[PDB]
Design an enzyme around this catalytic site. Structure first.
Site, mmCIF file in Angstrom:
data_model
loop_
_atom_site.group_PDB
_atom_site.id
_atom_site.type_symbol
_atom_site.label_atom_id
_atom_site.label_comp_id
_atom_site.label_asym_id
_atom_site.label_seq_id
_atom_site.Cartn_x
_atom_site.Cartn_y
_atom_site.Cartn_z
ATOM 1 N N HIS A 80 -11.088 79.949 -25.474
ATOM 2 C CA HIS A 80 -11.886 79.922 -26.687
ATOM 3 C C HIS A 80 -11.729 81.198 -27.505
ATOM 4 C CE1 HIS A 80 -15.121 82.344 -24.804
ATOM 5 N NE2 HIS A 80 -14.774 81.680 -23.716
ATOM 6 N N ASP A 82 -13.880 82.655 -29.565
ATOM 7 C CA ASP A 82 -15.125 83.349 -29.896
ATOM 8 C C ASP A 82 -15.643 84.261 -28.792
ATOM 9 O OD1 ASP A 82 -15.577 80.777 -28.562
ATOM 10 O OD2 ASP A 82 -17.661 81.281 -28.600
ATOM 11 N N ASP A 142 -13.119 88.301 -22.403
ATOM 12 C CA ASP A 142 -13.671 86.961 -22.469
ATOM 13 C C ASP A 142 -13.773 86.593 -23.950
ATOM 14 O OD1 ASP A 142 -14.858 84.863 -20.675
ATOM 15 O OD2 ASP A 142 -16.566 85.040 -21.997
ATOM 16 N N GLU A 175 -17.482 78.246 -27.696
ATOM 17 C CA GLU A 175 -17.814 78.130 -26.281
ATOM 18 C C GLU A 175 -19.124 78.819 -25.973
ATOM 19 O OE1 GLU A 175 -17.371 80.410 -23.202
ATOM 20 O OE2 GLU A 175 -18.188 78.663 -22.140
ATOM 21 N N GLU A 176 -19.329 79.977 -26.595
ATOM 22 C CA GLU A 176 -20.490 80.807 -26.306
ATOM 23 C C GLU A 176 -21.803 80.193 -26.797
ATOM 24 O OE1 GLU A 176 -19.384 82.238 -23.966
ATOM 25 O OE2 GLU A 176 -19.132 84.376 -24.280
ATOM 26 N N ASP A 198 -10.576 81.143 -18.290
ATOM 27 C CA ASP A 198 -11.838 81.724 -18.748
ATOM 28 C C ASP A 198 -12.714 82.322 -17.637
ATOM 29 O OD1 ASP A 198 -13.589 82.520 -20.717
ATOM 30 O OD2 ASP A 198 -14.658 80.666 -20.901
ATOM 31 N N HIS A 381 -19.971 89.799 -21.808
ATOM 32 C CA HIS A 381 -21.091 89.711 -22.751
ATOM 33 C C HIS A 381 -21.852 91.028 -22.991
ATOM 34 C CE1 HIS A 381 -21.072 85.647 -20.508
ATOM 35 N NE2 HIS A 381 -20.227 85.541 -21.517
HETATM 36 ZN ZN LIG Z 1 -15.446 82.686 -21.944
HETATM 37 ZN ZN LIG Z 2 -18.216 83.990 -21.673
#
Ligand SMILES: [Zn+2]
Ligand SMILES: [Zn+2]
Ligand SMILES: [Zn+2]
Ligand SMILES: [Zn+2]
EC number: 3.4.11.4
Lengths: 410, 411
Positions: A80, A82, A142, A175-176, A198, A381
């Site tokens: 992904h 994002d 990520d 995705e997030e 991922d 994150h």
């Molecule tokens: Zn991810």
């Molecule tokens: Zn993630």
């Protein structure tokens, strides 16, 4: 392979602000994602891949066509574009620590630090090239490490003329915010199975995730002037506290690990007249998942006993997603090739449950069984996110090998 | 006295929609209150009262001048012109029940009922004249019964030439939403003491009310993806649940009565990251009041004990009002005259507490001690609201007699 070109590729993606935003009807939720999607689309064309299509909802698909003759099953790799809304993805200013010596790493010039006291993994990464943040932002390994790896893997298969069938690639927008699978056109992707690149550290492979449901509780109480309340007033918040009290405190996200499920109160709001509670329920095992639902209902009836018709407790239960395990183990080749691949690249597979949801877990229940491949990244994150270049090289080597090994069985 | 005129007058005020509204900056909160305020102003001038004023905020004041010579103290009578938001005060449809014979009363054309099984005080009011709703609204006896009684007293005082000193009257705008005394000009009102005519059943006198304070609890937790929460997540909502478990469950509005105080959770809102609890403290005793403040602190320290500096529990206590008792009892003549009057009128005085606040309570701290006097009404703030015409006449008799007995004690 070429470690400089891999790093540069990755640093270029990382430099683009592609952070998601919740509560947005449009997909993708933010503009920045289109900029990475479109750069990627050009890159795939330029790499020689065919059928490169970017949908109107921000999903990017492309194919590296079969190398050799034979009926090889078509496989996919998915990432992904994002980054998490939890921390900035804008003007990420990566720090590069060559030959890491197992100490504290200062993030920028300030009192932010990456330290093995806080993150013992570091003890095990001596001599690797670590890529960190500067304290102000996420890194976005990520899942742009995933992207850089898939892209590099594509190149390797071509330049090293490694036999392979049709390789499918997709890059998803949100995705997030859990919208990373919603518009995924599995027919167009036309793969038998797939892998999201991922995950985390070197060797991680994931084919299990939680079964999920929301348990929403509406409580109607009776509220009069508190001074004359005696034998009349029914406090919805007092019932709410009674409900919560019966919920197994030890089976909570705070106290739970590995494969052990939980109940969790995410938000609540209320007065004496009306309170509303938002519980989530999580379990890898499905019987337990259902047993957990039954418990909440038992608590609702216990607490509800005694309430005059005008007062009541009402539970709405709603499944969100399921454990993909069944749809993956249904096809031994998927995890076997993945593990053989890693083992060939001298990686010890580390099977690890996803204590939550993944794009792949949704795809799995859509005709596209899809486990999770590692990325080389840690501490996602947050401002303490990092990645090793060597972790990323190993993730390329595994994608390539999976492609290679899939060809031998076709 | 003419019960006919008293009833007619009451029904005229009843018909006027004067429902109050909460969370409004303007005082009064609603247009309708101006209609009753202006009606009364003209009425007071027309009664021969002097110094009639209606402020830009809706407090109406007037004076019936001393009947006789002497150093007689000025006393006040106060009622509020608004009715509760809790039920409709628009197009009220009063039913007149003559010579109440003791059964259920049908409220309007429907299935709403005023019944002595639900309200056993009705077993005490046989033969009397009941005025009820039609089941679709409030009545507004609270407090338009009081307004009608005050106005009639002023008439009786004059028509019967009863010796009295200065009689102050006032009609306030936003009592049912807490503003009833916010813009009360005490100096201008110029009374040594007063009474609100805003009590209940015949004989009721009230000089004690709750001490009030709000307790606002702020809980800062720590939120992460639940999947990786172990050792890291701190649920603000879990901490709130723990605080609530510590607050004496038996000492709550649902369990309390008479003079006993309580803790009460009115409202709350939160997520893992942050929760806020809104408590209130009520107590008639000053010391016990402070003890309740201390228990909330005892609780918050304990539940917060062990937390990492990123998370905490932050209490904010704030007094809302106090018991008027000390301010009233300070002048034994206030209750004495009030009590004597009722006795002169063949009414046994009944002192009971206000399980909340009044305009008088605030007034009592602004330099105007101000107990509460009965109205004859019951079941306030709802469709079961009723009043007896004879009860209202008794209230008039008590008012006139208070004014009368005050003039005898020229000192
Ligand atoms: Zn991810
Ligand atoms: Zn993630
Ligand atoms: Zn009132
Ligand atoms: Zn009232």
């Amino acid at each position: 392979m070429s470690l400089d070109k891999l790093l540069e590729r990755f640093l270029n993606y990382v430099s683009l602000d592609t952070q998601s935003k919740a509560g947005v009807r449009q997909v993708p939720s933010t503009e920045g994602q289109w900029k990475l999607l479109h750069l990627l689309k050009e890159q795939l064309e330029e790499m020689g891949l065919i059928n490169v299509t970017l949908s109107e909802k921000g999903t990017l698909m492309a194919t590296l066509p079969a190398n050799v003759p034979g009926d090889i099953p078509a496989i996919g790799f998915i990432s992904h574009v994002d980054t998490s809304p939890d921390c900035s993805g804008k003007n990420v200013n990566p720090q590069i620590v060559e030959n890491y010596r197992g100490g504290d790493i200062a993030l920028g010039i300030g009192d932010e630090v990456l330290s093995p006291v806080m993150f013992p993994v570091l003890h095990q990464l001596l001599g690797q090239t670590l890529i960190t943040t500067d304290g102000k932002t996420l890194l976005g390994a990520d899942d742009k490490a995933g992207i850089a790896e898939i892209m590099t893997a594509l190149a390797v298969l071509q330049q090293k003329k490694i036999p392979h069938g049709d390789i499918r690639v997709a890059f998803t927008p949100d995705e997030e915010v859990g919208k990373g699978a919603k518009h995924f056109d599995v027919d167009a992707f036309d793969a038998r199975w797939a892998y999201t690149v991922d995950g985390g550290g070197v060797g991680e492979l994931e084919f299990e995730n939680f079964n999920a449901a929301s348990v929403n509780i509406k409580i109607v109480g009776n509220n009069v002037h508190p001074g004359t309340a005696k034998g009349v007033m029914v406090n919805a918040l007092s019932l709410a506290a009674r409900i919560h009290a019966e919920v197994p405190a030890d089976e909570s996200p705070e106290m739970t690990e590995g494969y052990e499920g939980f109940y969790h109160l995410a938000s609540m709001k209320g007065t004496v007249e009306r309170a509303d509670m938002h519980y989530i329920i999580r379990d890898f095992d499905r019987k337990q998942f259902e047993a957990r639902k039954r418990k909440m209902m038992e608590i609702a009836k216990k607490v509800g006993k005694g309430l005059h018709p005008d007062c009541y407790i009402e539970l709405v239960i709603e499944d969100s997603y399921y454990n993909m395990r069944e749809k993956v183990v249904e096809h031994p080749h998927i995890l076997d090739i993945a593990q053989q691949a890693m083992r060939d690249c001298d990686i010890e597979p580390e099977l690890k449950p996803i204590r939550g949801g993944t794009d792949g877990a949704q795809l799995s229940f859509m005709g596209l069984p899809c486990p999770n491949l590692f990325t080389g990244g840690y501490n996602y994150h947050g401002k303490h996110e990092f990645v090793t270049l060597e972790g990323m090289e190993k993730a390329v080597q595994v994608i390539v090998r999976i492609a290679e090994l899939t060809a031998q069985r076709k």
